[PDB]
């Protein structure tokens, strides 16, 4: 189904969706390294009750990077220079309640691009649903240290200052890593992560880094001054 | 094993084998795209009995694409610009009896354009084979319905005038899909179609679409008038 | 961790690493169709015993195409134009011993080119290990029979002068294929064998082809004179 065309306003007003949907497509004109502030939000409100928040203003780019990770891509087209395909459930889609239905809303948009929201729904149906939380380090802090317990997928931004990266594994042994060999661990596993419309590919953004999580419980991260370092991690749980 | 040469005339020979062959390797000088009215002929010829027939005139494109669905895909070389493997058993090669032979014509081809069959061989034998069917919708009817139990991959053309085409799923559940959405979740699955000489990727084709059909039992088409259009299927069964 | 940095002399140091490591990094700046003669030499000391050969002077295209074989695949950066990873334990290090360390040396490089190593730990320790040989057929033989018994890959250098290629499998069955084929089988199952800098990829080396070998106990090669064949064979054992 289609949801939303958005073009010409800064924001776009926000979209209720009654019918059970399990994926979202995401499509657009400009380019997957073109997106530069771009925001969504998504989130189901029960009736008599409090609402459930799977992503509280999530960057678009991180968004589409913590669905597309493996054997698939974000796609391009003829008339759309970037389509992605972002998974909602497990492997059915959402079973709504008697009074359950989902919100989705954009906000810092450009007033000369156009965004086009599509619903994809499958006969199977599940309770376990995606959540996207955020982490930050500072410019100030020389030595962080995050939980990242019962995640399986991370993104991290990419920038000159960070110096080593130790991770924490489930049986107690600490590994450090450097930049260089993260990013090539992280192309060993998925080698290309989009393709242009003319036919060149490109295996992954310049401020972006993927990082796949398996048994992994904290990250200790030392850097330098200068600059501030996002993370993005998406956990799967039962609401 | 060499089967054939084809070049300057416009239909090809009876060409009959005598091996037991397990897949078929075709080349040609022309890209994928460039296929337009290419049709193939494979079929089993007992002794005092009637014949076997696995595909009966086949579009070349459709052929290539119902055998390249996956991880592999169609290649290239300096010489040839086109270079496709197409199975015709499951694991291993078709089990020839007493008094049988494959057969297999080419009709439809160009004067100035050259193409070459090859045969291959494994030591395992099955007698699961490859059948290849034909449906076609016409361009006065505005709603159509197909039965695809017992398929597993379709090839669709492609047309602006289709609308809505709807899935009857082995449960009972009807999802609807526009062609826009369709394209995604199958480019989802398999993202590179095919890979050009110089270096470029492409998709998927202008005018053929591949459905993955995973209990699927029937399909409802909605469209306009001004097209026919084609479905392809393919199916294993044991002989 | 970083290993070393060559550039300007024509040979590198024995390089010895006491710390358990899993994997290596080449990052160079050359395309891979560029390597020429670069050979690389590992393998484990012991203390007062023998010491342990993995790989004896192999060459570096054959190192690369040895390890990248599958789903992954040599990247390419903005700074280096070649970077491979490389295993060299079945899932997890190598357990050194009490006085064990890895010595590796590079030989025949180049004089304005650069090079540089890097070494991958992870906490998991295992004891299998991959054994890397060397087999020669001369230019002027006609027929050699070789035994690849025990061995899952390997990479034969390309030549005109290669006739007739023929598999003896476990159950005794002989199945001769000529170069064409087995580069069309070698590529369906590995489509793209490297990416390069400008977004471009490669499906494989004009004078190198990868033979997956699944039960096969014998090769058989049938040629003429001219040129000597080089293959490089990779086996899993227990040290």
Chains 1, 2, 3 share one sequence.
Do not use: W
């Not at 994926?23 to 997106?35: E, G, K, N, P, Q």
């Not at 009074?99 to 007033?111: A, G, P, V």
């Amino acid at each position: 189904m289609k949801i939303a065309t958005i073009t010409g306003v800064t924001k776009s007003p926000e979209l209720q969706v009654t019918k059970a949907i399990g994926a979202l497509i995401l499509s657009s004109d400009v380019a997957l390294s073109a997106l530069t502030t771009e925001k969504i939000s998504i989130y189901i409100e029960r009736g008599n009750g409090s609402n459930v928040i799977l992503a509280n203003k999530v960057l678009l780019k991180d968004f589409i990077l913590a669905s597309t990770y493996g054997t698939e891509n974000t796609q391009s087209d003829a008339d759309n220079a970037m389509i992605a395909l972002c998974e909602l459930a497990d492997e059915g889609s959402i079973y709504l309640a008697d009074k359950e239905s989902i919100k989705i809303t954009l906000e810092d948009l450009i007033s000369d691009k156009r965004y086009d929201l599509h619903g994809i729904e499958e006969p199977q149906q599940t309770n376990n649903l995606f959540f996207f939380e955020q982490k930050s380090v500072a410019s100030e802090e020389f030595n962080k240290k995050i939980d990242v317990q019962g995640f399986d997928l991370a993104i991290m931004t990419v920038d000159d200052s960070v110096s080593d990266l130790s991770y924490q594994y489930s049986n107690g042994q600490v590994v450090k890593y450097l930049p260089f060999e993260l990013q090539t661990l992280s192309r060993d596993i998925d080698p290309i992560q989009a393709v242009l419309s003319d036919g060149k590919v490109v295996q992954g953004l310049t401020d972006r880094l993927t990082l796949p999580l398996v048994a992994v419980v904290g990250i200790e991260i030392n850097k330098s001054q200068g600059s501030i370092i996002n993370f993005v991690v998406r956990c799967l749980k039962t609401v």
